[PDB]
Amino acid sequence: NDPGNMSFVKETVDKLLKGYDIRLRPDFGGPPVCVGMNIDIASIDMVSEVNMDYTLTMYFQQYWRDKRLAYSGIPLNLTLDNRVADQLWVPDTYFLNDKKSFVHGVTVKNRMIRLHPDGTVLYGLRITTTAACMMDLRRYPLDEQNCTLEIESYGYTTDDIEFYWRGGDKAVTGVERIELPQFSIVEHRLVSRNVVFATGAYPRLSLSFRLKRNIGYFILQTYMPSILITILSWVSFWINYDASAARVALGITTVLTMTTINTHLRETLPKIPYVKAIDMYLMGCFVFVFLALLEYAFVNYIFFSQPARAAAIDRWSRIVFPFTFSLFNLVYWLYYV
Amino acid sequence: NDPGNMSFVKETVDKLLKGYDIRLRPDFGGPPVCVGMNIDIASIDMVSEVNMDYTLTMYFQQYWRDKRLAYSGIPLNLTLDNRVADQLWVPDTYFLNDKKSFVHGVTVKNRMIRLHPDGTVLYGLRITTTAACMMDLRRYPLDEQNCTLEIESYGYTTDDIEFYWRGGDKAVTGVERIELPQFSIVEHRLVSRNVVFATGAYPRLSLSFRLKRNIGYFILQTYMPSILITILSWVSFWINYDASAARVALGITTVLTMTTINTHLRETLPKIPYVKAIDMYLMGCFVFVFLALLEYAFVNYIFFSQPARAAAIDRWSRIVFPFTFSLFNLVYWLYYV
Amino acid sequence: NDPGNMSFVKETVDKLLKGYDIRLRPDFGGPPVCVGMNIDIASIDMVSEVNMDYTLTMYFQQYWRDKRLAYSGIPLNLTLDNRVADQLWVPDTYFLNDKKSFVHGVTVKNRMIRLHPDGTVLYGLRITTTAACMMDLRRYPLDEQNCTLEIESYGYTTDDIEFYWRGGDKAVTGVERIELPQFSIVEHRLVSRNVVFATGAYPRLSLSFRLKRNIGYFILQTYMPSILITILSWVSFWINYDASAARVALGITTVLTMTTINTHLRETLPKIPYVKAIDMYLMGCFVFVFLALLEYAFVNYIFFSQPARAAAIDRWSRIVFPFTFSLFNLVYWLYYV
Amino acid sequence: NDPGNMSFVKETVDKLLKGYDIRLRPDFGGPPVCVGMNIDIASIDMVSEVNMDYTLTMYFQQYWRDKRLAYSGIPLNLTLDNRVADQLWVPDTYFLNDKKSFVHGVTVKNRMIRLHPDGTVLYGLRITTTAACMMDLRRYPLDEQNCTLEIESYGYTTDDIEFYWRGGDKAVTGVERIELPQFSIVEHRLVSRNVVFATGAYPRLSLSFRLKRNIGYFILQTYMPSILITILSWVSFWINYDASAARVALGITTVLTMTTINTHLRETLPKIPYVKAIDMYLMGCFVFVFLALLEYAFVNYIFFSQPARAAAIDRWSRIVFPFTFSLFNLVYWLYYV
Amino acid sequence: NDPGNMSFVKETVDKLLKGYDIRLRPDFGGPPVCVGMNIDIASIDMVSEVNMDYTLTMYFQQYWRDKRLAYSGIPLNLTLDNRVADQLWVPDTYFLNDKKSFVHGVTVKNRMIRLHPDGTVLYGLRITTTAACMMDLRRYPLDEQNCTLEIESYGYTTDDIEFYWRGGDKAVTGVERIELPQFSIVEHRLVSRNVVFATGAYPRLSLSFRLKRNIGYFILQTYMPSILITILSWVSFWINYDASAARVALGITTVLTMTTINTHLRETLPKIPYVKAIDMYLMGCFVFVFLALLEYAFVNYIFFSQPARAAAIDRWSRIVFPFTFSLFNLVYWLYYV
């Protein structure tokens, strides 16, 4: 009779849990129970190309109705201590593609249960999850990635449990507040579908983001140092061919410098082994400095016999190398845009 | 009647827990319960730019009143074993921006419960928490950071629970004893406010520090080696231009040395990819050594035809390079102070 | 009488667990209980040569019959909450070669129990396991690996429990969907056998894959840089022998470049210490550049006394080195194919 | 009556735990309970300068008297299974400066409870703890460190619990058996005191060690390579000044070699950023090789105009550089001893 | 009467656990209980010189008799579910030198309990343990190590529990199947003894292995590259002394190459700081290349004044350096064999 009477509320709640069976879903043997889900994305911790995964922190909320929990006489929504969730049936929701997830537990287990007079249950969890994201890094670092989060029921088919995004397209919030230092989020989508398996159709909810990488860092730290070394290799062309020590030292040191750039960048670059766009550019620049030293090899071999022809080779090399390298840049960036 | 009678105290405490409901907050259905909080900061373990987080160890204390726990006849404050906290209602306090936190449990769970005759509860926890701190590292290593710790109730709105800093501005202690090897704490602030959400206003407490990085290490290990290499590149100007091997070797080795400095520092520097102030300085010095070798390319090309003009270019380069580099230093440090 | 009557189903299930003993296997003291197993491979997280292990995520399902759990009157398959599995006997199945495995527990423990009227139990678990895989890396990176997963009963012999692959060769699914960036799966096999131990025969199930490594990355990043340095060393042969500084600098810098390639690749290469095929090729190329500099040592020592003989040595070196290196390549790749 | 009668001992122990309250300390409301502590140090796992902590494994024993546990008729000390400790009051002892600690649990929880007829309790735990140790590394690697372990009661003041070292100065054993590869233990001290806090005085026990680092490794691997490069730079002085290519190459390569030593040592050196003694020596040697190349710059500029003065500068440089470097060594080692 | 009657077996087992006290050892107050132990070594995961520990996976079995568990009428050995071990007394066996150990728990806790009619208990556990192994690495990488596993009772003295190796020298199996990529096992020993402590003698079992490292990897990757650089330094002796640029560049580049070998190997070598045999060889080779460049310093200083004496120094250096280096190799390998 009195909502503020704590003794009466204890009697009301104990009546709900008297005879309550946690092993049975609501409306057992009848129509499936519809569970609505909405996510408040706290942050995206990291996106790892080496491990092919990303880490996500979110507020995961589930919304279903259990008529066994309906109470009367109290015109209020009962927010209960999170330890009562162990005494109730909850959906066996799991993330299909997650690798390691947990529920925060400081200072208490980050969980909330809110009851409603008609039997509706609001069930919230603060979850940090690492989900697998297979990344196509052929265009690295100019790549665009699409990482998803799959939500499914572990043991119940669509004859028992159905999923939907509560609130429509606005079910997932906090996407605009995500601050990824390396990526920029382009779009996010919410997909609801049933997936047919051996044991029957299973409810499925999908949340996906499209990530576009920021290339500003790689231009300054990776492409620019390699270009300048390639430019520096062409200095040998304008050096007089009689100076054997100067042009050989200049040619071989640029090759030495190029290898140091290549070898040390591999430590900073992702450890995943296969061909990438950045590797094609770095190897392309190494070929040019390799051919620049070979150019002087031909000139130095024929400088004594045919000075006019040796000088002619050197003069043309002052144009072919800048033109071919610029032509190589044109085709490379057009193919990677 | 006798405070020292252990049997009587057991009877008194068991009476308090007889009929006690942990699922209901104090004054359920009535005015919100006010929870006072104070923090004793044990230490700040680390501040990570790569992970964008910091680790904090603290004594977290909560102070509320529960009239269900009021006892009479014992004019003493009852300090109970920490296992009794599981038999009482405690606030569902959590840290909004934490990534991984735990309560120490050696040799026992680091927790204390103290009861008072009027029903007041003192609840302490020793917590190590890793909290996310988004760092703006454009001015790295001359950056100044502001890392916070957000405290909020997980399931209760301001109609049920209210937060305040117990003791005012002196609620948080131990800040002056924090010893960060890399940072110096400038100020800390305590903020109390209510944040409006979809489900209503939520109590919020904020503790923030301002961190100023120490630049002494970077001057000796990063800026000084790069400056001296740039100074060493200008030695080629005073070397006679006829010595083709000497000036070419000197010019190309400084470029080789500069790349080794750049590549190896990236391992020591933070792994976060984007433009930083230190990167601008390192790349700026590489341009100067790159142009120093290009300067001899022009001189060596025209030394035979116009010795006077080639010598004139060399003479002016002994002034422009020191002046431009000093001018570059002036604008760089003024823009980063 | 009514399948949709939740109260009747609770009575039926409680009758099954009344007097049920979890310490005794089904048909205790009689014929062994046959447990059928099928695996749905979610993914293969990683394959580590340094740790000699691979990480696997899968849906592990076990299928046995317990006549103590037979129920009548309900013509339906009872899917129960996963917390009921603690109240039933389950096989003590473990993975023989695993190093670290766990069952996912977000948002609930990833586990399902399904009962059938005849007493059959379907028991599913989502398990991430790290299994030891001893790899023969003599042919690295042209190696082919065979990693297995051994399934055995911990405490029961074949007189008590028997294993079989439920569904035959189609028991394990999802192998075709595995996407390993570095490896390609060639075949998988299912083996069932009994292994005789000291305490008797034990049931055993084996799932093995054959992995073939992708060599495309190593050709571009490891073999190609080393070959080009070896080619660049032969440039000294066509350089005139009077230029002492040029040929010595060219010869010694290629050795310097080769060491930098060798030393830095070790960081990228697996940390396991022993002889590998890639090490033989890298050391072979170092011998050629080492002998190239020794070739000029002989020429420079006898150029003054016998110019004709010194020139003859240089002329033959322009053929022997390309021929021997090509001959070395022919034998190397034939032995490693 | 019969000590060997297992049934009688069960009756005696069950009588002690009948009515026993774990929430109340012994002599509740009366004099404080004195807890004696002794530690058997198993090992010191590691000492980390990067993390500013050390790892310790020890046998932690606590010794107090509880008259509620007094028994008569059995003239024996009852060693009970470690699961009985959960049914008894134990001190809330914790380590003030620990970062991560645990109690070993294989094959059982490493814990022992021994009862005595007068009510005395012996309570042992095998604990591995990581304790914070703030290290002053200005004199690194010639530093001497003092790492402590603070022991305190979490919730009880000196009015309730008092601490003392059981056995006096011999309370802590196993210090002489500690084998640190990098450090040598000089002394250890045991301190007992009461620390006044806001809520009153708290018992405190302190165990501290003084660690002296071993410098033999750094002499061979760090100081010796840098000294020899500095010695090698002076070779240019005895080289004839007409050889422009030789002295420039020798001077610039020593600078290149010095940077490689500096950059690569940072990976092996601790990652903590600030000035250290080793950094001063490495930077000092770089200045000498930097000035050695500048010395030839002056000589090469004036060799044509004033050969006598240019030769005079070279002759004096053969003495000033060895003398200044030796003078630099004298002041450096005297200031760091 | 009927072994196959599951109801009768439940009655028999429940009778054993009726009145059973887990806090008391078998034959409490009487003769000590003898516990037999045998180990089936599954594998040795890794041996870490940096952490001074090794990881071991094994089947740990304990064999004792408890007359309280004797049953009659069932002529069979009762294999029970592993959850019954929590209802029985088990020895408090722990590993003295372990650092981190756990019992596998997928799909169940890897544990078995087998009862016998006379009261004998067979108790098995699958344990992965990391045990501390102090390694003497003065002879690294030609070192031979002896790693042990100490087994002891935590709380019981020899008056209560006694240990023995069940099966004699054949108690530990699977040693011959251990496959360490870096080490080869020479011998293993089983030791049983009582260790006298302050509180009395304690039972102790010791299992130790002798490990011999494989040096094949270090010969190819560490010793061979350093030897060839030292050989390459002697090329300067046969180069004509008039070529100042050639011999200086050759001498200083070998020093540069040697430092790169030394610095980069430290990353691959163990991080433990102190003198090792490999460090002596690497530093010895650096002295030879250091003295080789100093040899030309003397020759170049006196070539103009005394060409005959300068040539004489060069001629003798072609013999002393190969002889001293070979003499250095002879003493080094004899002292390290």
Ligand SMILES: *[C@@H]1O[C@H](CO)[C@@H](O[C@@H]2O[C@H](CO)[C@@H](O[C@@H]3O[C@H](CO[C@H]4O[C@H](CO)[C@@H](O)[C@H](O)[C@@H]4O)[C@@H](O)[C@H](O[C@H]4O[C@H](CO)[C@@H](O)[C@H](O)[C@@H]4O)[C@@H]3O)[C@H](O)[C@H]2NC(C)=O)[C@H](O)[C@H]1NC(C)=O
């Ligand atoms: C990252 O990558 C993933 C995987 O490719 C992308 O996920 C896909 O997203 C698209 C939408 O952008 C999904 O397409 C939609 O699927 C809905 C569900 O499909 C189920 O139901 C339909 C029948 O309704 C069945 O045919 C189907 O088999 C499933 O059972 C559909 O309802 C949608 O249909 C709507 O649009 C079509 C036109 O496209 C209309 O004709 C319809 O009337 C209706 O309006 C639609 O087809 C697709 O299913 C998702 N794939 C998966 C595997 O889930 C992410 O979008 C991507 N991320 C980003 C940022 O791009």
Ligand SMILES: *[C@@H]1O[C@H](CO)[C@@H](O[C@@H]2O[C@H](CO)[C@@H](O[C@@H]3O[C@H](CO[C@H]4O[C@H](CO)[C@@H](O)[C@H](O)[C@@H]4O)[C@@H](O)[C@H](O[C@H]4O[C@H](CO)[C@@H](O)[C@H](O)[C@@H]4O)[C@@H]3O)[C@H](O)[C@H]2NC(C)=O)[C@H](O)[C@H]1NC(C)=O
């Ligand atoms: C990775 O490496 C592992 C280990 O080498 C390979 O595993 C082996 O796989 C082969 C099959 O490819 C297995 O061979 C088969 O074993 C079955 C079980 O053996 C038990 O039972 C037989 C009697 O039936 C006993 O003799 C034996 O001792 C065992 O107790 C056999 O039933 C199979 O026999 C079938 O084929 C033979 C011909 O080969 C016929 O004569 C038979 O009639 C019958 O049709 C067969 O012998 C082998 O046992 C596996 N080894 C282990 C240790 O399990 C993986 O295959 C490999 N991975 C890849 C991808 O290659």
Ligand SMILES: *[C@@H]1O[C@H](CO)[C@@H](O[C@@H]2O[C@H](CO)[C@@H](O[C@@H]3O[C@H](CO[C@H]4O[C@H](CO)[C@@H](O)[C@H](O)[C@@H]4O)[C@@H](O)[C@H](O[C@H]4O[C@H](CO)[C@@H](O)[C@H](O)[C@@H]4O)[C@@H]3O)[C@H](O)[C@H]2NC(C)=O)[C@H](O)[C@H]1NC(C)=O
């Ligand atoms: C690593 O660094 C720590 C911190 O600096 C060192 O710890 C200190 O150790 C010294 C001893 O070496 C301690 O000094 C002793 O403290 C005792 C306790 O102090 C309490 O009680 C006294 C009154 O008795 C109060 O004044 C005080 O405020 C405390 O409440 C004292 O009892 C000792 O006094 C004894 O010596 C003095 C002379 O020194 C005599 O006059 C006295 O009569 C008596 O005999 C003494 O003062 C010091 O307290 C420790 N500091 C801390 C913070 O605990 C470690 O020693 C160091 N490690 C190594 C290896 O050097």
Ligand SMILES: *[C@@H]1O[C@H](CO)[C@@H](O[C@@H]2O[C@H](CO)[C@@H](O[C@@H]3O[C@H](CO[C@H]4O[C@H](CO)[C@@H](O)[C@H](O)[C@@H]4O)[C@@H](O)[C@H](O[C@H]4O[C@H](CO)[C@@H](O)[C@H](O)[C@@H]4O)[C@@H]3O)[C@H](O)[C@H]2NC(C)=O)[C@H](O)[C@H]1NC(C)=O
């Ligand atoms: C790695 O390093 C460890 C530590 O050094 C080695 O462990 C030692 O192994 C040897 C055997 O190889 C052990 O020696 C034996 O110890 C037994 C137990 O000693 C207890 O009991 C005896 C009395 O019986 C007491 O004197 C002693 O103090 C102990 O209380 C002895 O019973 C053995 O005696 C047998 O041999 C001797 C001759 O050597 C005969 O005279 C006896 O009659 C009898 O037959 C023997 O002394 C030694 O105890 C171990 N040390 C430790 C600390 O446990 C490992 O062997 C090594 N690993 C490898 C692979 O080498």
Ligand SMILES: *[C@@H]1O[C@H](CO)[C@@H](O[C@@H]2O[C@H](CO)[C@@H](O)[C@H](O)[C@H]2NC(C)=O)[C@H](O)[C@H]1NC(C)=O
């Ligand atoms: C029990 O705790 C209360 C609260 O800490 C103590 O009350 C304080 O008493 C001091 C004086 O001793 C006052 O200065 C404070 O203002 C009081 N605080 C409050 C909230 O009342 C009380 O003294 C303690 N009881 C005992 C026996 O120590």
Ligand SMILES: *[C@@H]1O[C@H](CO)[C@@H](O)[C@H](O)[C@H]1NC(C)=O
């Ligand atoms: C509060 O509810 C309890 C339980 O129904 C009841 O006994 C009590 O009388 C109520 N309070 C009042 C003031 O009536």
Ligand SMILES: *[C@@H]1O[C@H](CO)[C@@H](O)[C@H](O)[C@H]1NC(C)=O
């Ligand atoms: C202590 O309290 C108990 C419980 O109220 C009571 O039975 C006992 O008599 C008290 N002690 C004394 C000495 O009265």
Ligand SMILES: *[C@@H]1O[C@H](CO)[C@@H](O)[C@H](O)[C@H]1NC(C)=O
């Ligand atoms: C449902 O089953 C319960 C338990 O057997 C029974 O008491 C109840 O009457 C059943 N429902 C109906 C509508 O009969």
Ligand SMILES: *[C@@H]1O[C@H](CO)[C@@H](O)[C@H](O)[C@H]1NC(C)=O
């Ligand atoms: C052992 O103690 C029990 C409990 O006190 C008692 O019933 C039994 O008789 C004792 N044993 C003997 C031989 O008296």
Ligand SMILES: *[C@@H]1O[C@H](CO)[C@@H](O)[C@H](O)[C@H]1NC(C)=O
């Ligand atoms: C099996 O044992 C139970 C318990 O002792 C007994 O009641 C039952 O009669 C036995 N079975 C048969 C067939 O006698």
Ligand SMILES: [Cl-]
């Ligand atoms: Cl957490």
Ligand SMILES: [Cl-]
């Ligand atoms: Cl802890």
Ligand SMILES: [Cl-]
């Ligand atoms: Cl998980």
Ligand SMILES: [Cl-]
């Ligand atoms: Cl452990």
Ligand SMILES: [Cl-]
């Ligand atoms: Cl495990």
